[PDB]
Design a protein around this ligand. Structure first.
Ligand SMILES: CC(C)n1cnc2cnc(Nc3ccnc(-c4cnn(S(=O)(=O)C5CC5)c4)n3)cc21
Length: 302
């Protein structure tokens, strides 16, 4: 197929500064930082990811670097560069509001129908882009959707992306290790469920070994209280046995866009519209010299 002419930017250790740890886990360790390149007079807020110097960890992270450097869409996370230390770290855009899963849990009392429906549109757009680029994510979940601003989300974690999260997986994946754009659609359905429930754990308490049997019997995730039959019916279509019967991401963009034009017809939330989340038009929305600070989305290169 087509040659991948993406550029892999090697960044000097001296070009950036680690400020603090943002999070640790199975995924590794992610740090908050500032990237001050050459004599550019720019300060880019960044996130630095790394998993002992084991040859396997460097191999797996460089595989993620490959995919992350190959993507370029507003609703997908691109790699800014890599730093060749003993560990080898990924330099990415700082998403100041963290993952969407923690955001929906921590801000439920201020999340309205407009915000929820727009997130669904944005995830579908990012996902449709990955389909256009012939990439199968294989790990779409609310934990892998990061928040740049409450009005702007992006898909990340390309560590499993190809050209075990059982509770997010399509039945074909669990039983036969079959991954397609239509298996990502199933994971999209589960991600939407996580959002509408304000971060509930799918099939909470049920062990992963039971899931396969539960789905085979015809059991699916329940209808969230805020969801109209209109929104739940979409989620249900994402969880059909026949992958080709599931909607396409381009159809999910359309469906949720129509709904995002009249959000109170499709999501019933007590105290809707009166709710408000931070905006780039808010006071103190943007710790150091805020002079010369440029977001990665505005710091471009040929
Ligand atoms: C711990 C992590 C979720 N986190 C917390 N506050 C953050 C602020 N900004 C980013 N920035 C990016 C940008 C693009 N990709 C990532 C990225 C890729 N993989 N991961 S992960 O493995 O931490 C993911 C599973 C939670 C994050 N982070 C990541 C942040």
């Amino acid at each position: 197929e087509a040659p991948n002419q993406a550029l892999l930017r090697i960044l000097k250790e001296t070009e950036f500064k680690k400020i603090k740890v943002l999070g640790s886990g199975a995924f590794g360790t992610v740090y908050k930082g500032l990237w001050i390149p050459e004599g550019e007079k720019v300060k880019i807020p960044v996130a630095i990811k790394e998993l002992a110097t084991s040859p396997k960890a460097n191999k797996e992270i460089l595989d993620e670097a490959y995919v992350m450097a190959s993507v370029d869409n507003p609703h997908v996370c691109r790699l800014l560069g890599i730093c060749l230390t003993s560990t080898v770290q990924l330099i990415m855009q700082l998403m100041p509001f963290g993952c969407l899963l923690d955001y929906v849990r921590e801000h439920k009392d201020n999340i309205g129908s407009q915000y929820l429906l727009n997130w669904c549109v944005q995830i579908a757009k990012g996902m449709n882009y990955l389909e256009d680029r012939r990439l199968v994510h294989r790990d779409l979940a609310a934990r892998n959707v990061l928040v740049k601003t409450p009005q702007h989300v992006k898909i990340t974690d390309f560590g499993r992306a190809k050209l075990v999260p059982i509770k997010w997986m399509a039945l074909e994946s669990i039983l036969h290790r079959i991954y397609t754009h239509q298996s990502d659609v199933w994971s999209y359905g589960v991600t939407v469920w996580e959002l509408m429930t304000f971060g509930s754990k799918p099939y909470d308490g049920i062990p992963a070994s039971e899931i396969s049997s539960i789905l085979e019997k015809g059991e699916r995730l329940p209808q969230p209280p805020i969801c109209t039959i209109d929104v739940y019916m979409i989620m249900v279509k994402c969880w059909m046995i026949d992958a080709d019967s599931r909607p396409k991401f381009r159809e999910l963009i359309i469906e949720f866009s129509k709904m995002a034009r009249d959000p109170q017809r499709y999501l019933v939330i007590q105290g809707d519209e009166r709710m408000h989340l931070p905006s780039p038009t808010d006071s103190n929305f943007y710790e150091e010299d805020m002079d010369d600070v440029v977001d990665a989305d505005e710091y471009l290169i040929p």
